[PDB]
Design a binder for this molecule. Sequence first.
Ligand SMILES: O[C@@H]1[C@@H](O)[C@H](O)OC[C@H]1O
Ligand SMILES: [Ca+2]
Length: 305
Amino acid sequence: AAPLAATASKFLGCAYGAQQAPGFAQYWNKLTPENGGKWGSVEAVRDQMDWSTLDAAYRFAQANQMPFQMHVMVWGNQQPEWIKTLRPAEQRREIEQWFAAVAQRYPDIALLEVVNEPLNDPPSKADTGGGNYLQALGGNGDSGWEWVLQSFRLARRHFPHTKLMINDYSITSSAQATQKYLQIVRLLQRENLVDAIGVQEHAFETTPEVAVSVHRDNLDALAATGLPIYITEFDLDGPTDAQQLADYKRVFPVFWEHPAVHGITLWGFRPGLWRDKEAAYLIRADGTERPALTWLRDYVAAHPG
Ligand SMILES: O[C@@H]1[C@@H](O)[C@H](O)OC[C@H]1O
Ligand SMILES: [Ca+2]
């Protein structure tokens, strides 16, 4: 039994970790580590690196010839706790060492997610896993996004052959948010710092009060940069099987059939994925496939692009 996108022109991948492991390669052909590549997962204690969970995702991806998306170098959650109180110069040396460490250990990263959530969750908080290192990367600076520039400069320096991606949520749901995001992309491109645009597209981003057409128009706007688009963390809630199925039919094709979208990654498929309470899983606890998954296999087989 072969992955859904086996004969398609773009990948259909999934978040990977212990609860998503069973049967993974029979469904998906690309992966992102759900949690193990966050900095606070690897370096919870300063200067001792626990690569075990990240190694598990990378080794699995390689064993299965699937592209690996490193998630994530800079974010405002699940960052180490010890960095919060260091002076910015010291924080910066730690950031640099984290970049260099990842680059050395993982030579075959397909897509490096350098910054996730610049419009929503910058590393500027000092709560649990907040990081509080925005000023180590120059803060907002002249342009308003200096720290994003600095993060991508470090990634270019340390990963000279790797495709660099920016990622965020609640982008395609509004023109104003898409224009905001594209200002960051514009600033990055002044120095040719970014290679791909990611948008997460969780359930909360694609609800029907905003028409799918508006998401399509914003995809076109993002695509106007000439950069490839990736849908990075897709999920649709399933309080009933039928709501989930109807949502899949309404939402999924718009992203899948967009000529600038070069891959979609679901944010899990088995119970225990992030939106478990909302029953976003496509396979039930008893191992059975839900009607949205039945539909999705057929739809992807019929849409190779
Ligand atoms: O790491 C993921 C993040 O990028 C996004 O906010 O969705 C939840 C997290 O699991
Ligand atoms: Ca260190």
